[PDB]
Write a protein that binds this DNA or RNA. Sequence first.
DNA 1: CATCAGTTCGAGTCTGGTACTGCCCAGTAGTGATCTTATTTCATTATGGTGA
Length: 69
Amino acid sequence: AVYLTFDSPSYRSCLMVLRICVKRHGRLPQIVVVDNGAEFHSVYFETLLATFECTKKQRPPAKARFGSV
DNA sequence: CATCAGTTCGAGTCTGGTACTGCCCAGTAGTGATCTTATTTCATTATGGTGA
């Protein structure tokens, strides 16, 4: 899923990419890595991942190879 | 002798000792209504440091 918005990183971002994911494809990941953003340390994204049963994985700060691909 | 003092009789007046009558108010505890207040929640609002 690809999303484009003028705003800085904020949940809306996340609702969106995941909406399209669950829209044109069908479901959603199983383990979703996501750096140590704020959009990911928020309550909304974690609650949504819990609701849809996605294992949330977090790379350590300043390390980029963990999401290198 | 007839004047005044010591004696009587019965009525006037108070008072204790004993019993009794004709009459409605006052206080208290139920409810239902309508305020009233020392005290317990429902939102905004400011402060905080750091990884994308």
